Structures are given as structure tokens and as C-alpha cells.
Amino acid sequence: QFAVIGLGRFGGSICKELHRMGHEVLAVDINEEKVNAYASYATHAVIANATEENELLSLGIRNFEYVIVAIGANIQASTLTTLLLKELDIPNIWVKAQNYYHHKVLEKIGADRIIHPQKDMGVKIAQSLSDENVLNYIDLSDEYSIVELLATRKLDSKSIIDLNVRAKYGCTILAIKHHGDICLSPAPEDIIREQDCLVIMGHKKDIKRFENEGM
Amino acid sequence: QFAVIGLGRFGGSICKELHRMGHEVLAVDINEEKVNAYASYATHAVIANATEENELLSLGIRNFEYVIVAIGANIQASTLTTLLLKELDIPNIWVKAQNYYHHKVLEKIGADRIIHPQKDMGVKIAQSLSDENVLNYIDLSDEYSIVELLATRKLDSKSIIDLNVRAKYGCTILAIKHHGDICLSPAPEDIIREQDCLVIMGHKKDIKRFENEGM
Amino acid sequence: QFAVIGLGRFGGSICKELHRMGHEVLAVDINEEKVNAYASYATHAVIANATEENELLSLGIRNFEYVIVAIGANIQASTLTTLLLKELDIPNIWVKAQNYYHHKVLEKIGADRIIHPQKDMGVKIAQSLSDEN
Amino acid sequence: QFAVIGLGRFGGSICKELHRMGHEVLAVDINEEKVNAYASYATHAVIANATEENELLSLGIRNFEYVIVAIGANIQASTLTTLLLKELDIPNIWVKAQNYYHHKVLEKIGADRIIHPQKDMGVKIAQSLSDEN
Amino acid sequence: QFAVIGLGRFGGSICKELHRMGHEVLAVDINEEKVNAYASYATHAVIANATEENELLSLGIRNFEYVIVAIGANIQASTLTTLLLKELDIPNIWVKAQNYYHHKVLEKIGADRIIHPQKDMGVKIAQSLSDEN
Amino acid sequence: QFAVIGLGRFGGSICKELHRMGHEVLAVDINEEKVNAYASYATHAVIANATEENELLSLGIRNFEYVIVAIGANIQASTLTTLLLKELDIPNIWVKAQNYYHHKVLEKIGADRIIHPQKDMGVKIAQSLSDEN
Amino acid sequence: QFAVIGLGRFGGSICKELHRMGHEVLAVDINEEKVNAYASYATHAVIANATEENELLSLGIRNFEYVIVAIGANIQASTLTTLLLKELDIPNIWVKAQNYYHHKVLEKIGADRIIHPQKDMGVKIAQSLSDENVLNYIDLSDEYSIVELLATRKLDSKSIIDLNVRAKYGCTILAIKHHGDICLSPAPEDIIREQDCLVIMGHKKDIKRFENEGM
Amino acid sequence: QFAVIGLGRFGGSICKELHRMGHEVLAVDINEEKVNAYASYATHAVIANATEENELLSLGIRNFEYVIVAIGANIQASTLTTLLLKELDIPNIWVKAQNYYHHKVLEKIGADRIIHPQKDMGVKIAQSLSDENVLNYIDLSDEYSIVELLATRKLDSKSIIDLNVRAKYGCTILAIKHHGDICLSPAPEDIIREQDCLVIMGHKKDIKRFENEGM
Ligand SMILES: Nc1ncnc2c1ncn2[C@@H]1O[C@H](COP(=O)(O)OP(=O)(O)O)[C@@H](O)[C@H]1O
Ligand SMILES: Nc1ncnc2c1ncn2[C@@H]1O[C@H](COP(=O)(O)OP(=O)(O)O)[C@@H](O)[C@H]1O
Ligand SMILES: Nc1ncnc2c1ncn2[C@@H]1O[C@H](COP(=O)(O)OP(=O)(O)O)[C@@H](O)[C@H]1O
Ligand SMILES: Nc1ncnc2c1ncn2[C@@H]1O[C@H](COP(=O)(O)OP(=O)(O)O)[C@@H](O)[C@H]1O
Ligand SMILES: Nc1ncnc2c1ncn2[C@@H]1O[C@H](COP(=O)(O)OP(=O)(O)O)[C@@H](O)[C@H]1O
Ligand SMILES: Nc1ncnc2c1ncn2[C@@H]1O[C@H](COP(=O)(O)OP(=O)(O)O)[C@@H](O)[C@H]1O
Ligand SMILES: Nc1ncnc2c1ncn2[C@@H]1O[C@H](COP(=O)(O)OP(=O)(O)O)[C@@H](O)[C@H]1O
Ligand SMILES: Nc1ncnc2c1ncn2[C@@H]1O[C@H](COP(=O)(O)OP(=O)(O)O)[C@@H](O)[C@H]1O
């Protein structure tokens, strides 16, 4: 179902994670050491030059719905490989881009999705920096969002009804995670202890307000 | 308030994003071209060798609450920088790790947070791969999660009350985004049209079940 | 009618010859000396970075039916330029290829004609060697 | 009858084309991969450093009426090879020139024909652009 | 009982002297010549990259109570080796420091003793100059 | 009474320690920063190129009974300096050796004592490892 | 009148010596330090790339009757320089050759004189080796030579008439240098003291004979 | 009788020339190709590292009265070799110097003669440049010299008595070389034809005078 062509810092993580999730993954790499190291973290692991068409054919690359092109430094190899894959009519080709130019040429040679890892981690890290309590989040729209917050010493031993967010800030609490244990859509009697995960939902500015005065 | 020491693919994104959010950021780089290119995307931009203590002092680095060490290839430079910063009693030092070894030595020299960008993008990309319908998601815990899904033709013109997720699958719908318009905590009469954003919340396997039989 | 983007050993020859035949040619080059040397061998000669879209727009590159991409060594610059030209709906884009890979990426990004100079002169020279008469 | 010393974009084409025409061609190259790839496109293919006289002798280079010096980037190697060949009394020595200077030194050391591939393809491409019909 | 990882001016001396005293010493080195030269001055001598964990395991490095990290110039290799050894729960890890920074990072990753050779020989030489008698 | 020509890891230690013991020491260094840093750790500190005879004369190097040549990496500078000092009839010349070869040439050019810092600290460290008590 | 293009071990010596003799010399070098060091040993000294024609023109290189190309390692630079100089119609171009190939190409591009320094010093050193008594010499032809000899204890207090070289060995004595004082075409009564300079002239083998039995 | 340790541009010439003169020479070289190439130009040729004492012993280096150290670039190897040779009490050790420092250390480690090839060829070339007619010469003293001159079109078909040098310039002609044929101490009736070798003897300034007005 999944084939990962470059087993580096980026692609290797994709391989290991997909394997950990329970999907079947074929790992490819030109470097034998890399192939050996990922033998345990993949259904199958093969030594192959992804820029060589007959080798791609030998891999049975056609058996796959998703092929990930994760060769970092060598732009030539990456775009050539992506090209060969597009020739073989692979349904989904995901390639890691190094820069603007690489993104452009991948764009035109029919890459289905282009990933800028360090860029995205850039914005994500910026998000966590801007607010140290936000552990994670998802934006529903330009104005509305669901936010994951780390409870500070302002929130310990407080009940949901005490923190009347539904009226005071127009936001609603969705979940509380205490010592790994999880409470979904909790009732107003429930207690939030410090260092716990708190999942709020509402307007961005309203959530910021609640963070400011509340915690 | 924020200082970014390495203006590369990773650090540059952090800088640009922090600047876009409205925070004041001091960008550092040994490469003059990089400093010039990030002049517009930062409050201040300086040419400096982050491995030279007197230069760090010249930057007024102690005036900052958060310093980001984002020098990629040069592990020596990274750990040296982190060390010097730790000597200067910087409250929060975030460093990009290249490998396991780098993570360990940064860990021991008192790095406050160590980031593996390509790894994390690895797992999230794996997440988007496992379901093309999940546009985004957030893990509340090992078993429970909030998921954003792309509506298929199986869900078109279906009501929330028609798709009884709260009893049949034990999960709860949180939001519906239809042509950009947004419905928060929608009522059972509401309609879901295909290709719209659907926000479900619950157990991972249960949501997977709902994906399987429902859509 | 004709624009030549790279004034090197290859492109410069195209420019000079087209000019000698009596056609009007706009010569482009990032190197000022090259532009100066071909001032006499072209209707107009301009300093410009062919990988910069706004510069291409400033050249009035769309007013041309034929644009020749003759940047040799820099594969990246060549393909990026070809790309920008393809975006600007240029009717005929002819590019000099460095190798097989360059030929492939140029092929896919919609190059109208891809030339392998050394190859073609190769077969031509072989022809001349086969019968000197 | 024919020997091609540099199996690159230029020389490789000469080799392949001469072989395709039905002439017997000896392909030389310092790079083993190139030699391997042109085994099928030549009567014989040999790994050799064309700047080493004893290797040239080992090739039986004197048995040839036409020897082609097609080493691109390395001007030094090119002129050294041409020189050694001129010493071995080769009847016809054709060399690919990189620039004006290379053309001059090849000219003086007795090169029988000096080819500027990109230039000639330049004028021919200009010809084709001038009248597409 | 003793393992010396870097057989240079510093570590080689440790090895030779420990061997001369009658203790059993395992000498390690990435350079084959060094390993060969110290075969006679050690119980066992092995070619190995001290920055590679599986090689460390292959050496049976855990069987040793004292491991000496004596890699000079390469600070990275030194700290990486020290780190790997600290992971393998080596009881006593003594490392040669190049500078203040190296001393600090070795200090934090749990080096049992950090030696500054030139400094100590400095103070001792000063002692000898102060009273030659 | 004492002159230290190289203020590095080795020589700087000698200087600082001799100064701490109460002897008068003249510190030399080609690097101004080094001279500045050791201003407090020496009776006098001077910027000078030890391979330049007139500079040595300007230092009043002959007024000293002991001159320490502690220039590490630069073997040439070290031996040249030692040589100039031997010409100037310096009573005691002590030089830091880099390797066997350096030891040999220093040996022949009349060095009074040749020190191998890393070697000696090597045996010393081996001693400390043999009996931790 | 004289221009030296390469100020290295070879060319620098030519420059310095020509300057010491009293001729006016323009020294050229691409290396600024070299140009600075030869400022005192030349009429003029200039930083210039000898492979750049416009720079050569800027030097006023055509105003010179003799131009010396003494660039060692870089054969390409040497031949290119020689070529450019030949284009500028320089009357006399002397170039240092690195090897046989270099000698040949310089020969063909119209070098007026090609020098192999280490070769020539090779043969002369061989000459001084064959007889430690020959301090210097000059070959008139393949068979005949003029030789300068160091007097041994076999020749001490001997007269020219005592050592009848003109008949017994067919050679003729030309000069005697005794404690620096010099005697040209000395009379038969003159005495030769040991360790003095003796200038004989004749056939090589005959002089060797005289060395053998005489001294 | 002679051993040459470095078979390069310099040492190889010494070897070949000594061999051509008829002396027996042992050539040493660490490079096998060099040893093979000089097999024909030496009595014996051996592959050896001159910095290795036991190899020197294996060569039978002790059998030689003269050992030439002609290793160019590697100063360390040169001085180390010279040192080893001095330890083995070789009577005559001649070494090629690269620079001032090398000359100094060779001087102190007991080198019997130190040669600066390119320097000496420098002064020699300067001599031939200063006067194009002087082919060679030997200085008897600061003021007096014997000079070899190339006859110009001023001297063709002239008799020695016509060019009364013995009175007019105080100099005396010693030899005339015509088409390889040689005339020693020629009588006044003899003719000098152009392009012939002419050997004059006398005062330097006087010889210059004769060159000026005569030829
Ligand atoms: N032609 C190729 N075929 C297959 N695998 C390749 C090829 N070129 C590179 N790779 C693999 O891709 C990986 C690149 O990893 P890396 O350079 O760390 O990129 P990233 O930083 O994106 O992880 C390497 O592990 C290498 O083995
Ligand atoms: N010692 C240093 N001090 C300051 N900046 C540095 C230093 N070393 C490297 N840099 C900067 O850090 C940047 C590294 O970026 P890059 O190598 O792309 O890392 P990444 O791939 O993680 O973005 C370079 O642009 C360089 O200018
Ligand atoms: N990005 C660019 N935009 C515009 N001109 C460029 C760009 N990159 C290179 N050039 C020009 O193209 C020319 C390339 O010529 P060259 O490298 O000699 O190729 P060739 O050998 O095929 O002629 C150079 O003279 C350079 O000035
Ligand atoms: N010294 C040499 N002897 C023999 N062959 C050589 C030598 N140097 C280079 N070559 C060969 O000549 C070829 C030159 O090809 P290339 O650099 O592509 O020139 P071009 O661009 O003109 O084709 C290479 O394949 C190389 O193997
Ligand atoms: N990664 C490594 N693994 C094992 N041994 C190493 C490694 N790197 C260097 N060494 C060895 O360590 C020794 C270091 O010696 P040297 O550089 O002279 O240090 P010092 O000057 O302290 O003696 C070398 O002999 C080298 O072979
Ligand atoms: N020619 C010279 N004259 C005077 N001082 C010199 C000369 N060459 C080097 N030095 C000084 O000697 C010091 C050498 O120290 P270093 O290279 O660290 O050797 P070590 O590692 O043995 O201390 C340098 O600080 C330099 O300033
Ligand atoms: N292209 C050039 N133009 C001018 N000077 C040059 C050029 N290339 C080299 N040189 C000079 O010529 C000198 C070469 O000297 P060197 O390598 O010692 O030759 P040699 O050993 O024959 O003296 C260098 O000092 C360098 O500065
Ligand atoms: N350790 C050594 N033992 C023997 N021969 C050596 C050694 N090192 C170098 N050589 C020889 O000395 C020669 C040096 O020649 P080269 O570098 O041209 O110097 P030069 O310019 O004085 O001729 C080389 O041919 C090499 O084979």
C-alpha cells in the first residue's frame, strides 16, 4: 500500500511511523546500511537506485498506491525519480522539496503533493513559542479554532462550572487529559488539575482572552 | 522577546512566521546574504558568529526570553552555541537536532526543548497518508483523538441525526465547514454536503469504524 | 520576433547569425560584458536574470514568438527560465540540454524543442569523417 | 579506420553514428563506465588515458587514419593528447575546441581540423529559426 | 581491565606504559597502521571506529572497567565516543580535552576524569624551570 | 630569567605557573590577543615574530638564561625559532615537539631539552589509572 | 626593457639579478604579497593576471623588448600567457618549461627560448660532482673545454714550467688565482701554491689525464 | 660512487647526466614508475623510502661517497633523509633546498652542499639576457673574466689581427668554434665567421667595450 523511496531523517520517520500504525510498507534505499537498519521497521526493505527505471520495475513499484520520494540533497535524483514514477502512472506521488525551484519543477512534472518539512515545523514551532501553553491546535476557519492547552497553576483544582467559559468567553471545553486518563465532553462538576491537557473550542481572540485572564 | 540564530530552511521559517504573527524577533546569521534576505521578515537582522561569545554579548542576547538555535549541518557549531547561551543564563533555549547523538549532548548541556523537524513532519505526513480524508487532527491521548475529515459521496445530503455517531460509534461531531461557512457544535437537523469539512471526536478505532462503514 | 536568453558559446552564435541574416533579435544576459559585446550583434541587448519573473516581464518577453533558452552549465537556471516562459504562454521555447536528465525535465515542462549541440555536431562530424570529399 | 578518444556528449555521438553507418570504430575512454556503455556502439572499446604515450602505443593508435580528440572540459588533456598524436604521425587529427585560446594552441600544434560544436549548432539553429518551413 | 581508544601521542603513551607495567590493555584505533604499530605494545589491538556503537559492542567494550578516550583533533568524535561509552555504563571514562568548550561538554555528558595534557605538562615544566636542582 | 615564546595551551601554562611561583617571565606571542590575555600573568608581554631575528634582538632575548619555544602546529616556525636562539648563544633552549621528525631536527639543531607533553601526560595518566588510590 | 611575469623561486631570482646588474625591470605577479616583496628589487612592480589580455595591455607590455614568463605549476597559465604575448608581437619571449609536453607546446606557439632550470642545474651539478676540484668550467665543444681547478698538495710550490701541460698533456694554463690576487696568462717561472685557482684549457680527456697523474 | 635519492625534474637530470658521463650511479625513488623510467639511465635503480633507515641500509647506501638528496616539495622528507644520511656518516651529502628555512635546517644538520637550482638558473638567465651574445662565461675575479660570445654580423670574415684586441682593448682571444670544429689559441691569420663561438679573456669593462664598438 505504501512505498518509501528515501530512508533518511525524513523518509525513515515516515516509514517507521506507517509501520508502527500497522500499515504494510516497502522501504527502498540506495545505501545498504540504511536498508539494513530499516529491515525491522518495514514489511520489506530493498537496495535500489530510484533513478533507474528497470530497478523500479524490479521493486514491483506498480503494486503501490502511494510512493514517497524522500531524497533530500540530490535534487536531480529526486526530480528524475518523481518523473519516472509519473511515467509509471503511480496514483499518489509525494516528494520532499528542498527549495522554491525544486517545488516548481516537482509541481510541473505532476507531483501530487509537495512537502516542505522544515517550513511547516517552522510555523508549528512558532505557534508553540507564541503561546507556551498551546501544545497543539486545529483551525476551523480564519476566526474559529480548537486549541489544546497545558493547565497552569491558575487552573489546578478548578471545576468546569467555576471557569464559566461558555458564557464569559463564549468558548466550550471539549476534553480533559489527566495522567494519561481521558475525559471527553466533561460535565461541569469535573475537576481540572494542573499540568493536564485541556481542549477548548471557540473564537481565537476569545480563547486568547480566556488564556490571559483565566490562566 | 525572540531571537532566531540560524536563518536556514528551518529557522528562517520560524523567524518569518513569528514576525507575521506580530511578535518582535531578532534574526542572527553568519551569512550576510541570509541576513539581507530576512531584513524585511524581522524586527532586526544581524550578521554574527553564534560560536563567538563576545559577538553574542554584542547582540544583547541576554535581553531575550527565547533564543532559537537553528543551525543545521554543523553539529559542533550548534552545541557550542547552545552551551554559550546556557552560560549566559538564557531562560529558554530551543535547538534543532541533527541526530540521536546531537539530541543527547543538547539534552545534557541543558537544552530546554530539542526539536526533530523532519521526524515530526514524518509522523504527521504518515497521518495524512493513512487517511486522505483526514485534513488535520489532534491526538488527545494514546487512544482518543479529534479528527477533521473530508466528506465523500457517501455522506452527501446526510443529516447529523441520520449519522448517529454518538451511539452507533460512540463519537461526537464538533463542527461542519460548508463552502467556508462554519457551523460550531451543530444541531441534529443540520445537513452535511459532500467535500465539506467534518469534525469528529472520540476513540481512534471507533472513528476508523465510522470511516469504514459510514463513508 | 526572436529572443535569445543565454549569450554563451551556443546562444551567442544563434544571436549573431540571426542578426546577420537580417532578423530582429533581442539578446539577454545576466553578465554585463556579454551584453556589451553583443550590442552590435543584436537589435537590442539587455542585462537580465532569466529566473526572475518581473525581469522577464520588464523585457517584454511576451512580445516574442520565439525565445531561445541557452544557459549551459546552470541546469537549475535553465529549467526555471524555461518554466517561467511556459507560464507566460510563449509560443515557441527552444532550450539547450546538458544531459539526459535535463532533456527529461525540459521535455515535461513543455519545451517545444530540445537541442543537444555536441551530439548533433557529433553525428555531423562523423558524416564528414566518413566521406571527406 | 576511425578512433574516437573522448566518449562524451560530442565524441560518443561520433562513435555511435560512425558505428551505425557501418564503419569500424575504436572507442577510447579513461572512464570505465563510458567504455562499458559504448561496447555495443563500437567495434572495440578500451579504457585508456589519452595523455599517456605508452597507452596510446598499446591501443595501436598508429594503425588508424583518423583519430578524434573529443575531451571537453580538460583543455590540458586535449592539447596533450593532440600533441602526442601529432608525434605519432597520425594522418588526420580532429579536435574539439573549448575556446579561442584552445583553438589557437590546437592550430599551432598541427591539428588537421578544429571543431566548435556549439557555434556551428548555433548558426544552424539560427537557420532553422529564420525559416521554419 | 584497560582500554585505550585513541592511539596517538597521548593515548599511545598510555597504552605502551600500561603494557610495560604489566597490566592487560586493549588498544583501539580507526587507523590500521597505528593498530599494527601497537600490536607489540598491547595485549590486543583492534581497528575500530569509536563513534560506531555496534563496533564498540563488537570490541566487548563493556568488559572493561577503564576506557580511555584519547582522540585529539576531532572534538566531535571525542564527545560522541564518550557519550556512547556513557550509554554502555562504563564505570570509568577518562577523556582528553582540546579546549574549555570540550571540557564543558565532556563534563556534562558524564566524563569521570577530564585531562588537559599540555596544561599539566605546562605547570610541571614551570616547576622544573623554577628549581633545576 | 625566563622567556616563553609561544603562549598557547602548553606555553601559556608554563608562563602563568612561573609567574604564580614568583619568578619574572617575559611572554612572547605573534597574536596580539594572546599577549593581552597574558599581560596580567607575566612581568612583561610582547607581540613578536619569533622567526624574525631583529625582533628577537629587539626583545632583548639574550638577557635570558632560559627561553621556552612553545609553538605547536607550525613545525617550521618552531625549528626556525630554535635555530635563531641557538645562533644567539642562549644557554638553555627548551622546545615542544610535535612528532618524531620534529624531535630529530630539534635534537640536531642543539635544543637543550625536548618535551613531548601528550606523551608524558600519557604515562602519568596511565600511572593514575593503574592505582587510583 | 625587461619584464618578468612570474615572481617565484625562478622568476624572482631573474628579476632581482637583473635589477642588481642595473637594468630596469618591470615585475608582474598575481599574488599581492609577492609584488610587495619585490618592490625593492625592481624598477616597478604590479599585481596582474598574466592570462588576462586587457591587463597585459594595461601593463604596457608592448613597450618591452624582453618578457619572461616564469609561472611554474600552472601549465595552462604559462602557455596562455606565452600565447597572448606572442599575439602582442613581443620580440623576445622566454618561458620556463615544466615538462616535455610544455616544451613542445611552447615551441609550437613561438616561444623564443625555452628554459629547463632544474635540468641544467642538474648537468652543472653533475659537472661539479665528477671533479670536486672543478670549481667552474665552460664547454667550448663536445671534446674541448676550459676548466677551473682547485690545487691539491700535489701541485703546491710547483712551477708552470715544472708542470709542462702544453707538451705532456697538450693543454694550456690560462690563469692563477692566489689568495684572491690574479695572474692572467702567467709566465713559466710563476709558482702555483696549493688550494689556489688554476685555469687550464684543452681537451677534456687530456685535462682528466693531467688531473690523474699530475694532481 | 654516486647515489641519487630523488628522481624528479632535478635529481633525474643529475642521474641521467652522471650516467651519460660514464660514472656508475644508483638511483633511488619511492615511486615505482620513476624507478622504471630511470632503469636505463642508471647502473642500478631501486624503489625505496628515503625516510626509512632500514631501507637505506638495504640499499647499501654506505657504499657511496656522494649521495644526492633531491626530493622537492616534501621538506620534512628531505631534512629527515639528510639527517639519516648524516647519521650514517656519508662523506658528501648534497641536498636541494626549497626555501630559506630549508637551507637553514639543512645547513645545521650537516649538509655538505646546498643547491638552489632555480635561483642559480635565475642569475645565469639574467646573464644571458643582459647580453644576448654571451653564451657562457667564468669570472676569474671581481674585475677579470673569460667570456664566450656569439659572433654577430659585425665579425664575419674578420681576421684576429684585424680585431686587435690585445692592444685596443687589452683583451686576448682564446678560442674559435666554427661548425663544431674547434680552434684553440688561434694565430692572427685565422678567420672568425658569423654565428661562431668566440672565447675572449680580459677585464669585464674592456670586454663590454669590445662588444660595444666591435660587434
Ligand atoms: N538514488 C537514490 N535511490 C535510493 N535512495 C537514495 C538515493 N539517493 C539518496 N537516497 C537515500 O535518501 C536518503 C536521504 O536522506 P537525507 O539526505 O537525510 O534527506 P532528509 O534530510 O530529507 O532526510 C539517504 O538515506 C539515502 O540513502
Ligand atoms: N556559527 C554560525 N553562526 C551563525 N549562523 C550560522 C553559523 N553556522 C551556520 N549559520 C547559518 O545557519 C544557516 C543554516 O541553515 P541550513 O544549513 O539550511 O539548516 P536547516 O537545513 O536546518 O535550515 C545558514 O544559512 C548559516 O548562514
Ligand atoms: N539566471 C540567468 N539569467 C540570465 N542569464 C543567465 C542566467 N544564468 C546564466 N546566464 C547567462 O547565460 C550564459 C551561459 O553561457 P555558458 O555557461 O557558456 O553556456 P554555453 O556553454 O551553453 O554557452 C552566461 O553567459 C550567463 O551570463
Ligand atoms: N586524459 C584522458 N584520456 C582519455 N580520455 C579522457 C581523458 N580525459 C577525459 N577523457 C574522456 O573524454 C570525455 C569528455 O567528455 P565531456 O567532458 O562530456 O566532453 P564533451 O562535453 O565535449 O562531450 C569523458 O567521457 C572522459 O572519459
Ligand atoms: N572515530 C574514531 N574512532 C576510533 N579512533 C579514532 C577516531 N578518530 C580518531 N581516532 C584515533 O585517535 C588518535 C588521535 O591521535 P592524535 O590526533 O595524535 O591525538 P593526540 O594529539 O591527543 O595524540 C588517532 O591515532 C586516530 O587513529
Ligand atoms: N613565528 C612565530 N613567532 C612568534 N609566535 C608564534 C609564531 N608562530 C606561532 N606563534 C604563536 O605560538 C602559539 C602557538 O600555540 P598553539 O598553536 O596552540 O600550540 P600549542 O597547541 O602547543 O599551545 C600561537 O598562539 C601563536 O600566536
Ligand atoms: N596567471 C598568473 N598571472 C600572474 N602571476 C601568476 C599567475 N599564476 C601564478 N603567478 C605567480 O607566479 C608565481 C609562481 O612561482 P612558483 O610556483 O614558485 O614557480 P617556480 O617554482 O618556477 O618559481 C607565483 O608566486 C604566482 O604569484
Ligand atoms: N620519501 C621518498 N623517498 C624516495 N623518493 C622520493 C621520496 N619522496 C619523493 N621522492 C621522489 O622525489 C621526486 C621529487 O621530484 P619533484 O617534486 O619534481 O622535485 P624537483 O622539482 O626538485 O625535481 C619524485 O619523483 C619522487 O618520486
Author numbering:
A (entry chain B), B (entry chain A), G (entry chain A), H (entry chain B): 8 to 222
C (entry chain H), D (entry chain G), E (entry chain G), F (entry chain H): 8 to 140
What does the paper say about this structure?
KtrAB is a cation channel with a nucleotide-dependent RCK domain. KtrA binds nucleotides, ATP or ADP. ATP binding induces the adoption of a square-conformation by the octameric ring and increased K+ flux activity through KtrAB; ADP binding results in a non-square conformation and decreased flux.
We introduced the single-point mutations R16A, R16K, A80P and E125Q in KtrA and tested their impact in the complementation assay. However, and contrary to our predictions, none of the R16 mutations had an impact on the growth phenotype, while E125Q resulted in an apparently inactive KtrAB. Crystal structures of the mutants that did not rescue the TK2420 growth phenotype (A80P and E125Q) reveal a different picture. The ATP-bound structures do not adopt a square conformation, displaying L1/L2 distances for A80P (at 3.9 Å resolution) of 52/23 Å and for E125Q (at 4.1 Å resolution and with two different half-rings in the asymmetric unit) of 34/30 Å and 42/27 Å. In contrast, we found a large structural variability in the non-square structures, with four different conformational groups based on Cα N38 L1/L2 distances.
